Amino acid sequence: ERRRRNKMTAYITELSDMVPTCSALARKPDKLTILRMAVSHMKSLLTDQELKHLILEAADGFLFIVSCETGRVVYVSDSVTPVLNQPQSEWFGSTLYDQVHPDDVDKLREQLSTSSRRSFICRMRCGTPHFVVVHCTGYIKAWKFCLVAIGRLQVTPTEFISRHNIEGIFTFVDHRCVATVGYQPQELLGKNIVEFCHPEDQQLLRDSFQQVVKLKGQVLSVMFRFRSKTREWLWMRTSSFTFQNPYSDEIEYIICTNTNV
Amino acid sequence: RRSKETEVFYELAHELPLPHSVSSHLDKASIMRLAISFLRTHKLLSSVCSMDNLYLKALEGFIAVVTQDGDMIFLSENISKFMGLTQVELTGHSIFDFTHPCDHEEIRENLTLVSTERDFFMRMKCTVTNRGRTVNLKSATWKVLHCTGQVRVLSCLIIMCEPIQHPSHMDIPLDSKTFLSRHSMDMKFTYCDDRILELIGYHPEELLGRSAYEFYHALDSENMTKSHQNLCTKGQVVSGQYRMLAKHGGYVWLETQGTVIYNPRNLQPQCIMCVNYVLSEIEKNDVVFSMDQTE
Numbered sequence: 413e414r415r416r417r418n419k420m421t422a423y424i425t426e427l428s429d430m431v432p433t434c435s436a437l438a439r440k441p442d443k444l445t446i447l448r449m450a451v452s453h454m455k456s457l458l459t460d461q462e463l464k465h466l467i468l469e470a471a472d473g474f475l476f477i478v479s480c481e482t483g484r485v486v487y488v489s490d491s492v493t494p495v496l497n498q499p500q501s502e503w504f505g506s507t508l509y510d511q512v513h514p515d516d517v518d519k520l521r522e523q524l525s526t527s528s529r530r531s532f533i534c535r536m537r538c539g540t541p542h543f544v545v546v547h548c549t550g551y552i553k554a555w556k557f558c559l560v561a562i563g564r565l566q567v568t569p570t571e572f573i574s575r576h577n578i579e580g581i582f583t584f585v586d587h588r589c590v591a592t593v594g595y596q597p598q599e600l601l602g603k604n605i606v607e608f609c610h611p612e613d614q615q616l617l618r619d620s621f622q623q624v625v626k627l628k629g630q631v632l633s634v635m636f637r638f639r640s641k642t643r644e645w646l647w648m649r650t651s652s653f654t655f656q657n658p659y660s661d662e663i664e665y666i667i668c669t670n671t672n673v
Numbered sequence: 674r675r676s677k678e679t680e681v682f683y684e685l686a687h688e689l690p691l692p693h694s695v696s697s698h699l700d701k702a703s704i705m706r707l708a709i710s711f712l713r714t715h716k717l718l719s720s721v722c723s724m725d726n727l728y729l730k731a732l733e734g735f736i737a738v739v740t741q742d743g744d745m746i747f748l749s750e751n752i753s754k755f756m757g758l759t760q761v762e763l764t765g766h767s768i769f770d771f772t773h774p775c776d777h778e779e780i781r782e783n784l785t786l787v788s789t790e791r792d793f794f795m796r797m798k799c800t801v802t803n804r805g806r807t808v809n810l811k812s813a814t815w816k817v818l819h820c821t822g823q824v825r826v827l828s829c830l831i832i833m834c835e836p837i838q839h840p841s842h843m844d845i846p847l848d849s850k851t852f853l854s855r856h857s858m859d860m861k862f863t864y865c866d867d868r869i870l871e872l873i874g875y876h877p878e879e880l881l882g883r884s885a886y887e888f889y890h891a892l893d894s895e896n897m898t899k900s901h902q903n904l905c906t907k908g909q910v911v912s913g914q915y916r917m918l919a920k921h922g923g924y925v926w927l928e929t930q931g932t933v934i935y936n937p938r939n940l941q942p943q944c945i946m947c948v949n950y951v952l953s954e955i956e957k958n959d960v961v962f963s964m965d966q967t968e
Binding site for chain 1: 677678681682684685688689690701702705706708709711712713714715716718721722724725727728729730731732733736738747749790792821822823825831832833844845846848849850858859860884886887891892894898901902905913914918928950952953954957960961962963964967
């Protein structure tokens with residue numbers, strides 16, 4: 413083919429642009445030379461440390477090895493420091509159990525049993541008692557045993573929130589209702605939102621409800637008087653929208669945001 | 674002379690960071706692409722920093738750095754292990770030449786632009802079979818990879834690509850804090866294993882036929898919808914951390930792997946099998962969030 417030879421050249425060209433001792437040259441050397449100036453130039457020179465470096469960049473991961481029988485940390489890379497805000501000196505020579513959430517201790521015990529590939533998720537402490545979610549990947553290598561693994565990180569009242577069935581019945585409320593309306597979640601759950609609205613407002617609420625369903629997906633806001641736990645009538649605005657199943661587009665429930673005015 | 678070039682090409686191949694073995698079999702175009710990419714690679718790295726066999730083996734995935742225009746200028750060695758395709762075979766080629774076109778647009782925009790962070794799922798060609806073996810490029814399967822990394826200044830995207838272990842095909846050990854579930858495509862429970870009871874307090878009979886969305890804390894519902902659609906559209910997904918409402922108050926933290934299961938005989942999407950990683954004990958045990966908890 414024609415462009416066959418051209419792309420070897422683009423490659424070649426590229427090569428010399430990138431071999432400094434070749435690139436820094438008065439004019440461009442030939443094929444046989446650049447070919448032997450790159451050879452000499454790398455015979456000078458992926459780094460062992462670099463592969464490790466990429467992980468940190470990419471996965472925000474760091475490496476560690478622990479003795480399987482005890483959980484004794486036989487090694488931790490220093491990347492524990494950028495990853496965990498943790499000194500290798502804080503980490504090397506230690507026990508993984510010291511480093512996890514007391515509730516991750518059990519889960520941790522099962523991973524280190526004599527048996528292969530291993531992989532799990534756990535919460536670790538970072539210091540200046542705070543925990544972060546860490547995905548651990550690795551394998552068992554004898555060292556009576558050690559675990560070779562990588563831990564990486566992961567990417568990420570004025571009101572209270574409710575979910576309803578399309579009838580207006582309460583099926584979910586956050587703890588801020590107590591703060592917003594004085595009710596215990598139990599006191600709202602299972603009853604119709606209609607049952608909490610002032611008579612003179614109730615059709616608007618229903619109007620609102622017939623509309624948000626009909627105007628599927630989208631938000632509609634409506635304002636009404638809510639009866640507190642202490643019975644006093646409270647002005648409230650709730651903005652809500654319908655929530656549909658991503659597969660079926662069945663309406664899962666109505667989602668409301670109910671803001672004390 | 675041809676002879677005299679063929680000599681240095683070999684000289685170049687063996688001084689490529691490669692086994693004398695593999696170094697020895699390269700055509701010349703590849704020796705270019707691999708050498709080139711090695712220098713290209715080496716240039717990105719010094720910009721960032723200012724027993725690899727271990728690191729390589731601890732990985733549940735492979736590393737890629739890709740240019741804003743799609744060229745795959747570096748691919749870690751163990752990818753062959755996951756995608757069948759080897760470092761040599763792909764290096765210097767366009768990512769878009771190996772990803773589902775339905776994702777190209779998505780990839781493009783992850784390659785582009787001001788937060789640097791990147792996390793997404795991609796269908797990439799795989800020519801190694803479940804349990805060892807290998808296939809030809811025409812006999813390629815689509816494999817979903819979970820990609821996390823950062824876009825970084827000419828730009829580069831530096832990501833880790835992890836395969837999602839298939840529920841019917843498990844190399845890997847499971848502990849206590851994990852349970853299985855099956856769903857219809859709308860994520861309604863169609864099965865749940867006995868460990869759920871111990872773990873969260875529900876009986877499977879209480880969950881069967883029940884839509885997954887009603888047991889999510891509501892602050893999470895919108896976010897999980899994304900997981901669902903990903904799962905459907907691409908075939909597998911990893912959810913974020915989420916709270917699931919527990920039988921008697923409060924909720925648990927979860928992470929779930931979902932896979933669409935196919936009928937090998939009629940090639941119908943049969944169901945969704947979920948591996949659910951429980952990340953905590955019950956939190957806000959005191960707070961009743963939903964109607965079910967009443968029971």
